[PDB]
Write a protein that binds this ligand. Structure first.
Ligand SMILES: [Ca+2]
Ligand SMILES: [Ca+2]
Ligand SMILES: [Zn+2]
Length: 290
């Protein structure tokens, strides 16, 4: 089976910078790594290799895309912007196959949105339309990412009419292309339905532009995200610099609860990052302490 490469542009926005500071590039790489690990899983049934060839960080001095107010607007804004950066032929190292915008603007509290982001379906090799938006809110934005790129590869939600047929009645929502905020089974990240829709896409020659290998991609961390950022840090990434992990809430791994201000524990209900210590000889995998 012919091996694919997705030459990804990554764009961090004006507010993503304020939030992450110097820690940004590393953060963004840690997330992208994590998305890339999902596309590399045998469950997708295709040798797809997610790869960052460019990374751009804006100001505040750098006239970027007009992000906000909505998610639908942000995507049309981004996709028109991102083109001024691309090149005519996939022969120039600067040519990228798809683009992703991470923003820390609350779009999904003012506007409708897919998970915490948006994308069109089946666009991988259309430079005018191959692009995505993700609202960042922690390491788990690596799955928001994959879900949106999934759509880029012509995937649909696992609760659509076509997907019920293929996944079977006893299907769970523990996969990347589930319409809810996901808790992806890492033994089986992609469902049968997602596995098929991509196969058909690539087989019908829609991934013709993913065949060239980029000469110099950015290095992606090979350590777990829970080792790179501990529980407190992960909490800090979701909610703010003052947020500490509330470990006391059972079961370990299933939900990252973080402190806030009397005093409280809050949650976005997305698991602890994979490889967070949760026991003496234990770390978390897919929201469980194994
Ligand atoms: Ca190229
Ligand atoms: Ca390419
Ligand atoms: Zn979706």
């Amino acid at each position: 089976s012919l091996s694919r490469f997705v030459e990804t542009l990554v764009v961090a926005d004006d507010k993503m910078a304020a939030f992450h500071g110097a820690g940004l590039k590393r953060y963004l790489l840690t997330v992208m790594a994590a998305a890339a690990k999902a596309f590399k899983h045998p469950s997708i049934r295709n040798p797809v290799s997610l790869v960052v060839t460019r990374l751009v960080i804006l100001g505040s001095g750098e006239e970027g895309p007009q992000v906000g107010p909505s998610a639908a607007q942000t995507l049309r804004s981004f996709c028109a912007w991102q083109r001024g950066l691309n090149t005519p032929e996939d022969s120039d190292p600067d040519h990228f196959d798809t683009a992703i915008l991470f923003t820390r603007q609350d779009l999904c509290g003012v506007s409708t949105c897919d998970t915490l982001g948006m994308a069109d379906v089946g666009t991988v090799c259309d430079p005018a339309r191959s692009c995505a938006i993700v609202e960042d809110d922690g390491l788990q934005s690596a799955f928001t990412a994959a879900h949106q790129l999934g759509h880029v590869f012509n995937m649909l939600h696992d609760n659509s009419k076509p997907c019920i047929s293929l996944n079977g009645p006893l299907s769970t929502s523990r996969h990347v292309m589930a319409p809810v905020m996901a808790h992806v089974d890492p033994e089986e990240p992609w469902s049968p339905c997602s596995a098929r829709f991509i196969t058909d896409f690539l087989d019908n020659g829609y991934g013709h532009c993913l065949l060239d290998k980029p000469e110099a991609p950015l290095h992606l961390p090979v350590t777990f995200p829970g080792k790179d950022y501990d529980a407190d840090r992960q909490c800090q990434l979701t909610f703010g610099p003052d947020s500490r992990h509330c470990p006391q809430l059972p079961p370990p791994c299933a939900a990252l609860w973080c402190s806030g201000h009397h005093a409280m524990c809050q949650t976005k209900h997305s698991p602890w990052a994979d490889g967070t210590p949760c026991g003496p000889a234990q770390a978390c995998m897919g929201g469980r302490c194994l």
